[PDB]
């Protein structure tokens, strides 16, 4: 059993928790769960391999001075999630990107995945999907569109992330 910890990193006020709920109950509902140290654990099969997945949502980390870094150093994988309706998200999210390597200066292969919610609004999309893939590709990841309201491809970023870890992280070569 491979216990992989995913950190919902982002700008600071997008909606990472949203994708967090959809992956847990596959249902769009507002309840707001207080976070401080409590994480979510469950078992899911991966191409014929049952591994553990620990999710830990992170609120506005743009408040703490360095306490925020802890949330990133407490996890192996990272998920940079932002919103298309908020051009401020994609920008701030870019800043955190560099912060990820800081907490993992000892590590080499750093698993990451970028995604943009609010995709349910193709008419209110300010950031072109193609433009988001190119910029994000620089970091070494693939960007995808998702809708926390349709819960269609929300789980895609969760499963794909883990797969990237078992392959890239365990590689330590390529
Ligand atoms: N239509 C739509 N609404 C979304 C999506 N993701 C999040 N939302 C909405 O955005 C809001 C979430 O923001 P909020 O809970 O205030 O804060 P947050 O963005 O979770 N981060 P924080 O917990 O730090 O405040 C909710 O109203 C939720 O329904 C999405 O993909 N589509
Ligand atoms: Mg939240």
Swiss-Prot record:
<dbReference type="GO" id="GO:0006915">
    <property type="term" value="P:apoptotic process"/>
</dbReference>
<dbReference type="GO" id="GO:0060178">
    <property type="term" value="P:regulation of exocyst localization"/>
</dbReference>
<dbReference type="GO" id="GO:0005886">
    <property type="term" value="C:plasma membrane"/>
</dbReference>
<feature type="binding site">
    <location>
        <begin position="117"/>
        <end position="120"/>
    </location>
    <ligand>
        <name>GTP</name>
    </ligand>
</feature>
<dbReference type="GO" id="GO:0031623">
    <property type="term" value="P:receptor internalization"/>
</dbReference>
<keyword id="KW-0636">Prenylation</keyword>
<dbReference type="GO" id="GO:0051301">
    <property type="term" value="P:cell division"/>
</dbReference>
<comment type="function">
    <text>Multifunctional GTPase involved in a variety of cellular processes including gene expression, cell migration, cell proliferation, oncogenic transformation and membrane trafficking. Accomplishes its multiple functions by interacting with distinct downstream effectors. Acts as a GTP sensor for GTP-dependent exocytosis of dense core vesicles. Required both to stabilize the assembly of the exocyst complex and to localize functional exocyst complexes to the leading edge of migrating cells. Required for suppression of apoptosis.</text>
</comment>
<protein>
    <recommendedName>
        <fullName>Ras-related protein Ral-B</fullName>
        <ecNumber>3.6.5.2</ecNumber>
    </recommendedName>
</protein>
<keyword id="KW-0472">Membrane</keyword>
<dbReference type="GO" id="GO:0031625">
    <property type="term" value="F:ubiquitin protein ligase binding"/>
</dbReference>
<dbReference type="GO" id="GO:2000786">
    <property type="term" value="P:positive regulation of autophagosome assembly"/>
</dbReference>
<feature type="binding site">
    <location>
        <begin position="57"/>
        <end position="61"/>
    </location>
    <ligand>
        <name>GTP</name>
    </ligand>
</feature>
<keyword id="KW-1003">Cell membrane</keyword>
<keyword id="KW-0342">GTP-binding</keyword>
<keyword id="KW-0378">Hydrolase</keyword>
<feature type="compositionally biased region" description="Basic and acidic residues">
    <location>
        <begin position="169"/>
        <end position="174"/>
    </location>
</feature>
<dbReference type="GO" id="GO:0032091">
    <property type="term" value="P:negative regulation of protein binding"/>
</dbReference>
<dbReference type="GO" id="GO:0001934">
    <property type="term" value="P:positive regulation of protein phosphorylation"/>
</dbReference>
<dbReference type="GO" id="GO:0009267">
    <property type="term" value="P:cellular response to starvation"/>
</dbReference>
<dbReference type="GO" id="GO:0005525">
    <property type="term" value="F:GTP binding"/>
</dbReference>
<dbReference type="GO" id="GO:0051117">
    <property type="term" value="F:ATPase binding"/>
</dbReference>
<keyword id="KW-0132">Cell division</keyword>
<feature type="binding site">
    <location>
        <begin position="147"/>
        <end position="149"/>
    </location>
    <ligand>
        <name>GTP</name>
    </ligand>
</feature>
<dbReference type="GO" id="GO:0032092">
    <property type="term" value="P:positive regulation of protein binding"/>
</dbReference>
<keyword id="KW-0449">Lipoprotein</keyword>
<comment type="subunit">
    <text>Interacts with EXOC2/Sec5 and EXOC8/Exo84. Interacts (via effector domain) with RALBP1.</text>
</comment>
<dbReference type="GO" id="GO:0007265">
    <property type="term" value="P:Ras protein signal transduction"/>
</dbReference>
<feature type="short sequence motif" description="Effector region">
    <location>
        <begin position="32"/>
        <end position="40"/>
    </location>
</feature>
<dbReference type="GO" id="GO:0003924">
    <property type="term" value="F:GTPase activity"/>
</dbReference>
<keyword id="KW-0131">Cell cycle</keyword>
<keyword id="KW-0053">Apoptosis</keyword>
<dbReference type="GO" id="GO:0071902">
    <property type="term" value="P:positive regulation of protein serine/threonine kinase activity"/>
</dbReference>
<dbReference type="GO" id="GO:0007165">
    <property type="term" value="P:signal transduction"/>
</dbReference>
<dbReference type="GO" id="GO:0019003">
    <property type="term" value="F:GDP binding"/>
</dbReference>
<dbReference type="GO" id="GO:0045742">
    <property type="term" value="P:positive regulation of epidermal growth factor receptor signaling pathway"/>
</dbReference>
<dbReference type="GO" id="GO:0071360">
    <property type="term" value="P:cellular response to exogenous dsRNA"/>
</dbReference>
<feature type="binding site">
    <location>
        <begin position="10"/>
        <end position="18"/>
    </location>
    <ligand>
        <name>GTP</name>
    </ligand>
</feature>
<dbReference type="GO" id="GO:0003925">
    <property type="term" value="F:G protein activity"/>
</dbReference>
<comment type="similarity">
    <text>Belongs to the small GTPase superfamily. Ras family.</text>
</comment>
<dbReference type="GO" id="GO:0030496">
    <property type="term" value="C:midbody"/>
</dbReference>
<keyword id="KW-0488">Methylation</keyword>
């Amino acid at each position: 059993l491979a216990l992989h910890k995913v950190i919902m990193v982002g700008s600071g006020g997008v909606g990472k928790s949203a994708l967090t709920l959809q992956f847990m109950y596959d249902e769009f509902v507002e309840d707001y769960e207080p976070t401080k140290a409590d994480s979510y654990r469950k078992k899911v099969v991966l191409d014929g391999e049952e591994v553990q997945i620990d999710i830990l949502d992170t609120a506005g980390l743009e408040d703490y001075a360095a306490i925020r870094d802890n949330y990133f150093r407490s996890g192996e994988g990272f998920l940079l999630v932002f919103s298309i309706t908020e051009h401020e998200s994609f920008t701030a999210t870019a800043e955190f990107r560099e912060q990820i390597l800081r907490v993992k200066a000892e590590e080499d292969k750093i698993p990451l995945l970028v995604v943009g919610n609010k995709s349910d609004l193709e008419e209110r999309r300010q950031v072109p999907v193609e433009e988001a893939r190119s910029k994000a590709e620089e970091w070494g990841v693939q960007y995808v569109e998702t809708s926390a309201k349709t819960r269609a491809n929300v789980d895609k970023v969760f499963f794909d992330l883990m797969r990237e870890i078992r392959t890239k992280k365990m590689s330590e070569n390529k």
